[PDB]
Structures are given as C-alpha cells and as structure tokens.
C-alpha cells in the first residue's frame, strides 16, 4: 500500500509545486509592484513642491501615466500556460480591465488544499494587492473614507495634476489637499502591499518549510 | 539493505536539499553583506561635507 | 616674514603663511610685487562621490534582484534552475523599502525635496538610478549650498545621505533587520545542523 | 549685544534689485557665525576672516 499513499502525497505535492510556482510569480510581480510604487512616491514628492510650472506638472502627469501603464500591465500579466495568476478562482477570466481596471475574476478567494489536514487561502484575489486598505495604518486626515483601489488613488492624483490649478487660491488649495491625501494614500497602499508580501512570503517560506516538514513527518510515520 | 538506504536517501532528499539551500543562503548573506558594506562605504564617502 | 594681502599687513614667523585668508596656504620663496592668486570653485570631487555612490547602489540592486531571480517553467516540472535563491525572505524587502523611503528626504530646508532635481532619476521598469551629467553639473555650479544641505544636510540627522547611513547602521549594528537576520538565520543554521545530525542518527538506526 | 535675540543685515547694491537680508539668531553674534551666515546665503558676497 506504499504506492497508493505515496501517490496521494505526490498529488498533494504536485498541487504544492504549482502553488509555489504561482506564488513565486506573485513575488516577482509584487516586487515590480513595489519598485513602481516607490517611483510613484518619488514622483509625487517631486510634485509636492509648492511652486511648479505647467510643463513640470504635465511631465509629472505623463510619467505617472506611464507608471500606471506598467502597473496594470504587471497586474494583467498572463502566466506561461496562458492563465492569469491574479485572476482568482477562475483563471480564464481576465483579472482587470485595461481602462476601468475592475476585478472580473471570482470574488470567492481560491481555495487550494496544500494538505488534507491544513487548508488555507494559498492564492490571493487580484483585488487584494490593490483593492484592500489596512486598518493599522494611520488614517488620512482629509477624509474618513479611503478609496480602496491603488489605481484610483493615483488616478485622482493625475486628475488633480492635469487640470491647471494656477491663478485661483481656492483651486490651488484643493490641488494641494488632493496631492496630500493621494500621497498618504500611496503610503497606506504601500503598507498594504508590504503586509500582502509578508503573508504571501510566509506561505512560500515558513509554510512551505512547514509543508516539507509535514511531508517528512508523514514519511517517518509511514516508515 | 540497499532499498532501506535508498529510502533513507529519499527522505533526506528534502533534508539535504534544505541543507544545500541553507548553504546557498549563507553564501548569499555573505555576498549581500559585502555589497551592503561597499554601499555603506560609498554612502559615508558621500556624507562628508567638505566636498561641496 | 612680512607680506601684504589685499591691503592687509601680515607678519609671520615662517615662510609658510596659512591663516590669511583662512583656508589658503602660501609658500614664499622670494620677494614678489603684485602677484595675483586666483581661487575658483571646482565641483569634481562631489560629482565623483555621487557617481560612485550611484554605482554602488546599482550593484547592490543587481545583487538584490539576483537573490530574487526566478525562472518560470512552462510545463510545470520543478528543478533548481536558480529559481529558488532567496525568494520570500523579508530581509531584502525591508532593506529595499527602508533605502527607498530614505530617498525621499525629511526636513530639508532646500527647495529641492527629492533627488530628481539634482539629476539622479530611476527608470520605471528597471528600478535603477541613472544621472544626467549636464543638469548635475549645472546644479552643482549654481546652487552648491542647497545640494549640500539636501544630501549631507546637518550631517547628524537631516539629509538623505545621513538618514541612509543611520538606518543602514541600525540594520548592521545590533537587532537590525540584516544583523538580526544574521543572528536568527545563524540560530536556524544551528537548529538545522542539529536536525542533520538527527537525520544521520536516524539513518544509522534504520540501517 | 547680549540682549538682542533677532538680527538682520541688509545689503544694497546698484546691480541688485531687492536688498539682501541676512538673518542672525540670538547666539550668532560670534564672528565665525557671521561668516557662516553671509556665506550660506550664497548671494555673491563672500565673507572671510584674516588674522593679521
């Protein structure tokens, strides 16, 4: 009966290998997400200057548009098999739209059984890496409500930036308030991305080691 | 006896792979600390104000 | 020795005059009339230091990316293929996040609030720093005080370079993310070595 | 003077449009402090100390 139980453990192991490959792709994409977010923060801090010309803000806006293009391209990345890693439960469906960026995958988080005893959320919804805001982070003073998506944050940033705000004190004040809230929203989003990496990183590090240790324990129990 | 040793090696295969991974991690930490200390040297070389 | 600098009479005990004006050392060899000494500002030292700092950062980022290098497998078979390396480790994440956060200066009195104005900007896809020599040289020529107070700052707790140095030292000194990482991974290595000894004992018992 | 807490130095030149203002705190009446104040403003006026 060695062969059958070994085959059961081996099919769980194949599920584990596919999960590890998927979360490794997640780590790479999320690292490129982190590099982009930091570039966006630098760009916003550059825009944080009190006085700027129209050309400077236009250049900042087009650079931010390029950064968003890279960010959605990473979010809409297609896996080697042709599926979408961040699609969710349904791999065939596209995870985000090119323009709206809404989540079209399965709302119910994909549940893959790493083992019979332990079941957890191995794959994460594509929304969580942009469409979730942590509570432990400091709230934004400007508004109690903080729009969850990372995309819409810097979209509001470019919306404030593109419109020429010079010449009106009230309009300059609203632009400054929008820039302030969007930068602290970027910081909160970066906190969310860091927490997402920590949970995913533990899954493919300490939990993956836990899976290996459990396989060793099962081998010893069989032996 | 050969089959028992083979099964022991099979069980050790995750264990010996983790040992090789730990050695690789230690070498990576050494190289990372070397690069980080090179960067610290460059940063402190920049920290002097008399250059300006 | 007796000389006269810009209408001020200077008397010294030796032929090496140093404190008129403070910061200029004159060696006198023979009596002179109406010599001209011209002092002009050079920014080569600062630009070389900045360039070497950028190069060191780029090398560090290359190593950090190599530790996270991963190779996707189309059919799904699992092999080494240098894919594992140091994936999933929070140490590299913390180091990169801390450094990149320090790139944004805090409490800088200068008009410049980031490193873009000085001329060091990062490509979005690559994430590595590159400079423009013409703009950097012009900024050094026009506003050297602003650049100094941005990068060097007060030299203790204000400025990009001093904050980077402080956080890196905190990481390396004790209980810091890389030093605590070394300590924790060394304890893990000791535990794993005990585990390997236990596995050897298990092999002996089974055989 | 010991009593004053804020000090200004106003320098007017024919080529300069708006007169230059140098700000000194209470504890900066030292000659080295005046040199550093006038140099750090980077206005084109260079202050120096010569020991006769």
**How far apart, in whole angstroms, are the C-alpha atoms of residue A149 and residue A185?**
10
The string of DSSP letters for A157-168 reads HHHHHHS--TT-
Report the structure determination method: cryo-EM
Cβ neighbours of D49 in C, within 8 Å: 21-22
**How far apart, in whole angstroms, are the C-alpha atoms of residue C178 and residue B28?**
12
Residue A194 has its nearest CB partner, among C74, C97, C113, at C97
- Give me C121's structure tokens: 């900007």
Query: Angle at which helices A169-204 and A2-47 pack, to 10 degrees?
Result: 160
Residue A108's Cβ-count burial label (10 Å; 0-12, 13-18, 19+) is exposed
Which residue's entry shows tokens 């180091």? C95
Residue C95 near chain A (CB below 8 Å): no
Closest CA to C91 of C64, C71, C121, C109: C64
Closest-CA distance, A108 to chain C, in angstroms, reads 25
- Give me A12's structure tokens: 């769980």
- Give me A26's structure tokens: 């997640």
- Give me A195's structure tokens: 């927490």
- Tell me which chain C residue has its CA closest to the CA of residue A38: C100
- For chain A, list the strands marked E by DSSP: none
Residue A100's Cβ-count burial label (10 Å; 0-12, 13-18, 19+) is exposed
Query: Considering only CB atoms, which residues of chain C are within 8 Å of chain D?
Result: 5, 8-11, 19-22, 143-145
- Tell me which chain B residue has its CA closest to the CA of residue A220: B11
D19-33 burial by CB neighbour count: b if 16+ within 10 A, else e?
eeebebeeeeeeeee
Closest CA to A157 of A121, A123, A181, A127: A181
If one counts every other C-beta atom within 10 angstroms of the C-beta of residue A91, the result is: 19
DSSP state of C53: H
- State in Å, rounded, how far the first CA of chain B is from the last one: 75
Residue A24 has its nearest CB partner, among C70, C93, C115, at C70
- The residues facing C4 across adjacent strands are C9
Test A216 with B18 for CB contact under 8 angstroms.
no
Query: In chain D, which residues are last before a break of more than 2.5 Å from C to the next N?
Result: none
Neighbours of chain A (3+ CB pairs under 8 A): B, C
CA C108-C109-C110 angle, to 5 degrees, is 90
User: What values do phi and psi take at D24, rounded to 5?
Assistant: -130, 135
If one counts every other C-beta atom within 10 angstroms of the C-beta of residue A213, the result is: 14
- Give me C204's structure tokens: 């002996």
For residues A200 and A22, the answer to whether their CB atoms sit within 8 Å is: no
Cα of C53 vs its chain's centroid, Å: 5
Test C21 with D50 for CB contact under 8 angstroms.
yes
Closest CA to A193 of A74, A15, A109: A74
If one counts every other C-beta atom within 10 angstroms of the C-beta of residue C6, the result is: 9
- The residues facing A103 across adjacent strands are A96
For residue D32, how many C-alpha atoms fall within 13 Å in the half-sphere facing its CB?
Answer: 2
**How far apart, in whole angstroms, are the C-alpha atoms of residue D37 and residue D20?**
12
Residue B19 near chain C (CB below 8 Å): yes
**How far apart, in whole angstroms, are the C-alpha atoms of residue A89 and residue A75?**
16
Test D49 with C8 for CB contact under 8 angstroms.
no
Closest-CA distance, B20 to chain C, in angstroms, reads 11
Residue A203's Cβ-count burial label (10 Å; 0-12, 13-18, 19+) is buried
- The residues facing A179 across adjacent strands are none
- The residues facing A112 across adjacent strands are A120
SS3 A220: helix
Cβ neighbours of B11 in C, within 8 Å: 199
The rounded radius of gyration (Å) of the Cα atoms in chain A is 22
* Residue C177 CA: distances (Å) to CA of B17, C95, C169, C184, D9: 26, 8, 10, 10, 49
Test C21 with D52 for CB contact under 8 angstroms.
no
User: What values do phi and psi take at C197, rounded to 5?
Assistant: -60, -40
Residue D42 has its nearest CB partner, among C8, C20, C145, at C145
- Give me D7's structure tokens: 């000090």
């Amino acid at each position: 009966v060695l062969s059958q139980a070994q085959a059961q453990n081996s099919q769980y192991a194949l599920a584990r290998t596919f999960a590890t490959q998927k979360v490794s792709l997640e780590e790479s994409v999320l690292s490129q997400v982190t590099t982009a977010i930091q570039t966006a923060q630098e760009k916003i801090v550059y825009a944080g200057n009190g006085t700027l010309s129209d050309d400077d803000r236009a250049s900042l806006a087009t650079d931010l548009q390029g950064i968003r293009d890279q960010l959605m391209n990473l979010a809409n990345s297609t896996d080697g098999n042709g599926r979408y890693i961040f699609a969710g439960y349904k791999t065939e469906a596209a995870p985000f739209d090119q323009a709206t960026g809404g989540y079209h995958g399965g709302e119910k988080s994909v549940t893959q059984q790493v083992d019979s005893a332990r079941t957890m959320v191995i794959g994460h919804t594509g929304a969580q890496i942009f469409n979730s805001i942590t509570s432990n982070a400091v709230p934004e003073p400007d508004g109690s409500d903080s729009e969850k998506n990372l995309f819409v944050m810097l979209d509001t940033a470019i919306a404030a930036l593109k419109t020429p705000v010079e010449g009106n004190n009230v309009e300059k004040e609203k632009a400054a308030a929008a820039i302030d809230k969007t930068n602290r929203g970027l910081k909160n989003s970066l906190n969310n991305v860091l927490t997402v990496r920590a949970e995913l990183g533990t899954q493919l590090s300490e939990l993956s080691t836990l899976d290996s240790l459990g396989s060793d324990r099962a081998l010893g129990q069989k032996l | 006896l050969t089959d028992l040793t083979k099964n022991e090696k099979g069980r050790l295969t995750p264990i010996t792979k983790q040992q090789s991974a730990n050695s690789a991690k230690l070498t990576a930490y050494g190289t990372l600390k070397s690069a980080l200390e090179k960067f610290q040297t460059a940063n402190t070389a920049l920290n002097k104000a008399d250059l300006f | 020795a007796k000389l006269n600098v810009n209408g001020i009479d200077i008397e010294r005990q030796s032929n090496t005059v140093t404190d008129a004006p403070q910061g200029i050392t004159l060696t006198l060899t023979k009596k002179v009339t109406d010599a001209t000494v011209t002092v002009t500002k050079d920014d080569t030292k600062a630009k070389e230091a900045i360039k070497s700092w950028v190069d060191a950062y780029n090398s560090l980022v290359d190593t950090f990316s190599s530790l996270t290098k991963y190779t996707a497998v189309e059919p799904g078979e699992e092999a080494s293929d240098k894919n594992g390396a140091l994936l999933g480790d929070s140490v590299v994440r913390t180091i990169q996040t801390g450094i990149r956060a320090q790139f944004a200066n805090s409490g800088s009195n200068s008009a410049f609030k980031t490193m873009a104005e000085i001329g060091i900007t990062q490509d979005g896809t690559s994430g590595k720093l590159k400079i423009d020599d013409d703009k950097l040289t012009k900024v050094l020529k026009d506003n050297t005080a602003a650049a100094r107070e941005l990068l060097v700052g007060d030299g203790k707790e204000t400025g990009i370079t001093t904050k980077i140095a402080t956080e890196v030292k905190s990481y390396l000194a004790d209980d810091g993310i890389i030093d605590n990482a070394q300590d924790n991974v060394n304890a893990t290595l000791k535990s794993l070595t005990k585990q390997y000894l236990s596995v050897s004992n298990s092999i002996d018992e089974t055989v | 003077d010991t009593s004053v807490t804020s000090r200004t130095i106003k320098i007017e030149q024919p080529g300069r449009k708006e007169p230059l203002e140098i700000k000194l705190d209470k504890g900066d009446t030292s000659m080295e402090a005046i040199r550093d104040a006038i140099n750090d403003a980077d206005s084109g006026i260079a202050a120096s100390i010569v020991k006769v």
